[PDB]
Specification:
Order of helices and strands of chain B: HHHH
Chains: A mainly alpha (203), B mainly alpha (136), C mainly alpha (118), D mainly alpha (42)
Chain A: Nucleoporin p54
Structural class of chain D: mainly alpha
Oligomer: part of a larger assembly
Keywords: Nuclear pore complex, Nucleocytoplasmic transport, Transport protein
Entry title: Alternative composite structure of the inner ring of the human nuclear pore complex (16 copies of Nup188, 16 copies of Nup205)
Organism of A: Homo sapiens
Radius of gyration of chain D: 14 Å
Structural class of chain B: mainly alpha
Order of helices and strands of chain D: HH
Number of strands of chain B: 0
PDB class: transport protein
Chain lengths: 203, 136, 118, 42
């Protein structure tokens, strides 16, 4: 109400019909009320405030900037813990599996063990010499490594030159990819929700 | 006009810090699950060297164990291989434009491929869902 | 940060299965100790990792076979371009557009079912 | 201007293609331009 409180009833010696009209004319009434301004020093006035104002804007913007730096600094070198954790996980998985496995040889023979076991064992046999043998290994892995290197040798030279290039003009195409990235992230999260609004179609 | 942006900057900044905090203390704790679950896989090194000592004061022999020892190596082996395959892929990627790796060019080709890959999913996870609808 | 959220959800999910295959393991053999039995787990989970791996092998040969199609290419591989970047992006702005089709495509499809249910 | 997004992106995508032990997710090879456009088309 208090707005209502001061804006009417007029100010400084400002005419009541003009003061009215600044009220109607007001482009943006909550953010704003009509305030009487008085010739040049008053504009001087305003400017002094503007500057006053300017410095504080700049600063608060700096505060946001510092907090963001702190978050990024924590985040960027914190990837370390995530990666470390993950590897630790895999090693613990290997030990888990190894302990799990030895609890099935020592208590378990017993020499009982078979049944289900062979099926495990059929699966395992298959996968294992699949792999082996033959085929794969050899041929493939190192026609690829034999190969890779020869392409390396050759690519270097052809290079030589060409002749700079065009790097340069790389800045943006920065920029336009940013905007494709957000569009894709919205589509992915919408598909994910789609099938939600879907298991529920589990109906 | 700028001040307003400033506002939803402040906003969304301290909700980023609500973020990180959180994820921060999270990582401690996922981390602690890793110190506990470890001390005590052993002290599971009792319970398993006891069985051993006990089992030794038995008739003898151990058996049908090897298969597992094979299974773990077999399971383990490919893990070996994934690394090698990774060790290749990186080399292949490395073979690619000189005088400046630090340019924007490769930046745009990386990012862009990231987009293409993500788009792919979106495709048939979508097609999935689109697929899936038929039963209904 | 955002990105950092999925990473923990993965580490979450995982320490949880490993806490545990670690728990199907202690205290199971803890019993033993007194005298009980926990075990045809494994057979469960062992054959479960097999099934797990079974596919991972296929992934390996899928990637391997891509590499050489890729190298293969690299061999063809060897010659200038600003226009193409543009040509790419005008295509991406089409590709995203049909994909959106499909997603609304699906989304509305789901929505239909959801409507039918009630 | 001072931007840090696509530096995240590139970041991500950088951080993407290199490794690791993660039981599944192996680094991917990056195409671009000629092969990619066609790849997009498929």
């Amino acid at each position: 109400a208090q707005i209502k409180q001061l804006l009417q009833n007029p100010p400084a010696g400002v005419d009541p019909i003009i003061w009215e009209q600044a009220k109607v004319d007001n482009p943006d009434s909550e953010k704003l009320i009509p305030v009487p301004m008085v010739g040049f020093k008053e504009l001087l006035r305003r400017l002094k405030v503007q500057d006053q104002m300017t410095k504080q804007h700049q600063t608060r913007l700096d505060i946001i900037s510092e907090d963001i730096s702190e978050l990024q600094k924590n985040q960027t070198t914190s990837v370390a813990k995530i990666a470390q954790y993950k590897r630790k996980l895999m090693d613990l998985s290997h030990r888990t599996l190894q302990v799990l496995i030895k609890q099935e040889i020592q208590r378990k023979s017993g020499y009982a063990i078979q049944a289900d076991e062979e099926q495990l064992r059929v699966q395992l046999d298959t996968i294992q010499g699949e792999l082996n043998a033959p085929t794969q290994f050899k041929g493939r892995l190192n026609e690829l490594m034999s190969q890779i290197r020869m392409q390396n040798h050759f690519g270097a030279v052809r290079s030589e030159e060409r002749y700079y290039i065009d790097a340069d003009l790389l800045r943006e195409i920065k920029q336009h990819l940013k905007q494709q990235q957000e569009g894709l992230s919205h589509l992915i999260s919408i598909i994910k929700d789609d099938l939600e609004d879907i298991k529920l179609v589990e109906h | 006009e700028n001040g307003e942006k400033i506002t939803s900057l402040h906003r969304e900044v301290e909700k980023v810090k609500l973020d990180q905090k959180r994820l921060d203390q999270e990582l401690d704790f996922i981390l602690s699950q890793q110190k506990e679950l470890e001390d005590l896989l052993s002290p599971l090194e009792e319970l398993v060297k006891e069985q051993s000592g006990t089992i030794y004061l038995q008739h003898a022999d151990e058996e049908r164990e090897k298969t597992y020892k094979l299974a773990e190596n077999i399971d383990a082996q490919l893990k070996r291989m994934a690394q090698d395959l990774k060790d290749i892929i990186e080399h292949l990627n490395t073979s690619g434009a000189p005088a400046d790796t630090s340019d924007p060019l490769q930046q745009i080709c990386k990012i862009l491929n990231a987009h293409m890959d993500s788009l792919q999913w979106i495709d048939q996870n979508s097609a999935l869902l689109q697929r899936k609808v038929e039963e209904v | 940060i955002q990105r950092n959220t999925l990473n923990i959800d993965k580490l979450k999910i995982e320490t949880a299965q490993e806490l545990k295959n670690a728990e199907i393991a202690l205290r199971t053999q803890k019993t033993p100790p007194g005298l009980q039995h926990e075990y045809a787990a494994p057979a469960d989970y062992f054959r479960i990792l097999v099934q797990q791996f079974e596919v991972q092998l296929q992934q390996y040969r899928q990637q391997i076979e891509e590499l050489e199609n890729h190298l293969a290419t690299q061999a063809n591989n060897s010659h200038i371009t600003p226009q193409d970047l543009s040509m790419a992006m005008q295509k991406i702005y089409q590709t995203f557009v049909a994909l959106a089709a499909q997603l609304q495509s699906i989304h509305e499809n789901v929505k239909v079912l959801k409507e039918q249910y009630l | 201007m001072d931007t840090e997004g696509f530096g995240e992106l590139l970041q991500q995508a950088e951080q993407l293609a290199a490794e690791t032990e993660g039981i599944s997710e192996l680094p991917h090879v990056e195409r671009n331009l000629q092969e990619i456009q066609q790849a997009g088309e498929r």
